[PDB]
Amino acid sequence: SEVAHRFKDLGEENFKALVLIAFAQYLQQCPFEDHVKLVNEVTEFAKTCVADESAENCDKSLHTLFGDKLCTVAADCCAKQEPERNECFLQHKDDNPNLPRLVRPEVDVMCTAFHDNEETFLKKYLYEIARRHPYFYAPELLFFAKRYKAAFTECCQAADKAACLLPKLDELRDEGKASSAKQRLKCASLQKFGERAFKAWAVARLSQRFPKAEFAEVSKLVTDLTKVHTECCHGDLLECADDRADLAKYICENQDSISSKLKECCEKPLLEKSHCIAEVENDEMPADLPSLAADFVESKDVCKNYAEAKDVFLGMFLYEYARRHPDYSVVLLLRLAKTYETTLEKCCAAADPHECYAKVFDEFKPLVEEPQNLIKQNCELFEQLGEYKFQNALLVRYTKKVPQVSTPTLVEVSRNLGKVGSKCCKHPEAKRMPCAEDYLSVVLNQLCVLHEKTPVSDRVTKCCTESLVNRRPCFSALEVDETYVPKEFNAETFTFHADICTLSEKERQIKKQTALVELVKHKPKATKEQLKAVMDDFAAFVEKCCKADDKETCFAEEGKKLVAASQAA
Ligand SMILES: CC[C@@H](Cc1c(I)cc(I)c(O)c1I)C(=O)O
Ligand SMILES: CC[C@@H](Cc1c(I)cc(I)c(O)c1I)C(=O)O
Ligand SMILES: CC[C@@H](Cc1c(I)cc(I)c(O)c1I)C(=O)O
Numbered sequence: 259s260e261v262a263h264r265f266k267d268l269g270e271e272n273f274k275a276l277v278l279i280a281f282a283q284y285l286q287q288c289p290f291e292d293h294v295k296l297v298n299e300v301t302e303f304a305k306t307c308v309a310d311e312s313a314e315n316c317d318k319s320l321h322t323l324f325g326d327k328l329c330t331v332a333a334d335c336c337a338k339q340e341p342e343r344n345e346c347f348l349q350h351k352d353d354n355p356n357l358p359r360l361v362r363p364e365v366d367v368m369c370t371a372f373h374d375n376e377e378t379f380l381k382k383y384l385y386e387i388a389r390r391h392p393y394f395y396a397p398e399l400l401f402f403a404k405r406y407k408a409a410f411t412e413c414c415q416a417a418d419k420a421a422c423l424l425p426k427l428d429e430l431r432d433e434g435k436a437s438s439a440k441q442r443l444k445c446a447s448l449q450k451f452g453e454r455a456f457k458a459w460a461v462a463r464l465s466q467r468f469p470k471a472e473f474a475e476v477s478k479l480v481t482d483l484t485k486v487h488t489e490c491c492h493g494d495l496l497e498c499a500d501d502r503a504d505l506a507k508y509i510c511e512n513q514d515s516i517s518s519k520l521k522e523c524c525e526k527p528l529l530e531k532s533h534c535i536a537e538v539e540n541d542e543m544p545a546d547l548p549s550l551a552a553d554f555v556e557s558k559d560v561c562k563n564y565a566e567a568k569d570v571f572l573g574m575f576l577y578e579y580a581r582r583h584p585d586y587s588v589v590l591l592l593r594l595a596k597t598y599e600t601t602l603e604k605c606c607a608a609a610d611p612h613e614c615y616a617k618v619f620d621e622f623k624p625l626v627e628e629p630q631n632l633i634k635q636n637c638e639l640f641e642q643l644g645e646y647k648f649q650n651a652l653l654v655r656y657t658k659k660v661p662q663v664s665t666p667t668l669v670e671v672s673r674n675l676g677k678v679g680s681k682c683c684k685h686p687e688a689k690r691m692p693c694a695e696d697y698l699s700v701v702l703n704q705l706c707v708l709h710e711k712t713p714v715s716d717r718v719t720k721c722c723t724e725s726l727v728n729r730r731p732c733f734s735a736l737e738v739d740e741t742y743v744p745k746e747f748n749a750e751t752f753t754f755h756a757d758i759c760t761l762s763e764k765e766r767q768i769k770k771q772t773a774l775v776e777l778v779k780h781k782p783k784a785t786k787e788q789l790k791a792v793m794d795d796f797a798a799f800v801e802k803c804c805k806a807d808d809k810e811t812c813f814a815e816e817g818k819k820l821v822a823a824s825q826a827a
């Protein structure tokens with residue numbers, strides 16, 4: 259009885275939550291009520307399996323159980339059986355579900371609902387989250403749930419609940435969206451590029467983090483993590499949550515053989531412990547570490563070792579190069595690994611290989627500097643314009659690259675691409691590349707998945723498909739789509755109403771940004787100057803209507819003066 263196994267290990271709480279998360283991510287459209295029913299129903303059945311391990315169906319598997327459950331409230335997916343049926347659910351996971359933006363009422367009401375029904379209040383949380391992020395790292399979502407409870411606990415007992423809650427909640431929202439995106443990458447990596455890609459990625463990341471840990475150690479960790487994330491990404495949340503616990507235990511047990519900064523983490527409760535490790539800063543770099551050239555360039559036994567065990571040898575190279583380069587991004591370390599392999603392929607087949615792969619590090623030079631210079635450039639640019647103007651530049655640039663992409667997607671992705679400026683440019687050159695280029699891997703992966711649903715640009719498709727590691731370079735190389743035929747103007751697209759006078763300031767900028775995109779799509783050839791020339795005028799167009807009492811008309815009357823000058827430029 260698998261159900262019993264998981265129940266005993268995780269307890270009633272986590273089990274309940276994890277099961278809720280699972281259902282919400284599968285049937286994101288079904289309402290909260292229908293889900294809680296199914297959860298309790300499954301939980302009650304789970305209990306009759308812990309002691310009575312031979313009760314009917316306790317022998318069955320988690321998919322069969324969960325599947326038969328969901329199919330009682332859904333249609334073609336339920337027409338299938340094992341494997342088939344399950345996978346059918348996974349393929350129908352929506353990354354951009356048409357769901358009503360989650361608004362949160364006055365501080366007073368939420369506290370009443372929380373103090374009144376606390377268990378339901380938190381369940382409602384997981385459900386609304388899990389359904390808008392079908393690939394959320396489940397075990398981590400539990401950690402956030404706790405902090406969510408801890409926020410209301412304190413703040414609902416304060417003089418000014420508002421000034422206490424709102425911040426803690428804004429900070430949770432962000433940290434949550436960031437976590438969701440990091441995970442979504444892990445899943446895309448596994449599903450779209452396979453176990454090898456993810457493993458290589460994990461080895462580089464872990465090598466950097468745990469430069470003192472031996473290769474055999476890192477490799478053992480990578481293998482476990484793969485299992486965990488394979489399970490989480492496929493919906494095996496119970497098995498994931500369990501295995502993740504096992505791993506975190508193993509890591510705190512072998513602290514000495516891994517990292518000297520796990521001390522803090524291993525003293526905390528499970529949830530806090532797991533979250534602590536995944537965020538632990540890199541360990542110190544071992545003192546006297548030999549030059550990489552000795553074993554991977556100068557040695558005359560290279561092509562032999564490469565032939566003997568390619569994947570192990572290259573793995574060793576990556577582990578060895580990453581551990582001594584925390585200043586390099588993970589994707590860069592991989593580019594170097596691909597470049598190294600490719601060279602061995604060529605050279606090991608030649609007459610004198612040793613002098614074929616003699617000047618290999620000279621091939622790295624260009625790959626190392628490209629990121630460095632682009633970083634340096636875009637930071638100084640960012641420093642002179644600020645986050646807002648900087649986002650605009652990216653809006654215009656990326657809209658020129660791939661005009662076919664939907665405006666909502668462009669605005670989101672660009673805005674996110676711009677946040678890299680504030681996140682990373684503050685750091686010293688030493689920690690810049692990891693922060694920057696890896697964060698862009700996540701943002702670009704967002705663009706890819708959202709595109710994958712409804713493809714409209716082969717340039718997005720290409721850059722998204724042919725290499726995970728080269729995604730960013732591939733995109734930077736793009737300039738202007740020359741085959742793109744500009745779209746004509748649509749009245750409804752350039753109609754500024756008074757409703758924009760109640761939106762926040764951010765909500766207003768996002769409307770001024772959504773417009774800029776539509777403009778570029780109409781005149782891609784237009785110049786950065788001519789655009790700013792009208793962009794400035796767009797600000798004036800609205801700094802009037804909302805300031806003309808008792809005239810809803812303004813939106814149209816002034817809108818005429820707007821479009822008029824618009825068609826001009
Ligand atoms: C800004 C919307 C977020 C959802 C979200 C999250 I994640 C965590 C908390 I706390 C929230 O209040 C909210 I709203 C998203 O759609 O990514
Ligand atoms: C290397 C994988 C993760 C970090 C990580 C680690 I190290 C340990 C546990 I347990 C986790 O759940 C996670 I996520 C990353 O670097 O993105
Ligand atoms: C480095 C120059 C910018 C160009 C640019 C563009 I295109 C549109 C607007 I509006 C701008 O303010 C700017 I500066 C870029 O290519 O990233």
Ligand SMILES: CC[C@@H](Cc1c(I)cc(I)c(O)c1I)C(=O)O
Pocket residue numbers: 629632633634636637652675676678679682683694695698730733734735
């Ligand atoms: C040319 C810059 C790259 C992306 C990039 C990089 I690399 C570093 C920083 I700092 C950024 O803000 C950004 I945007 C691109 O847009 O193609």
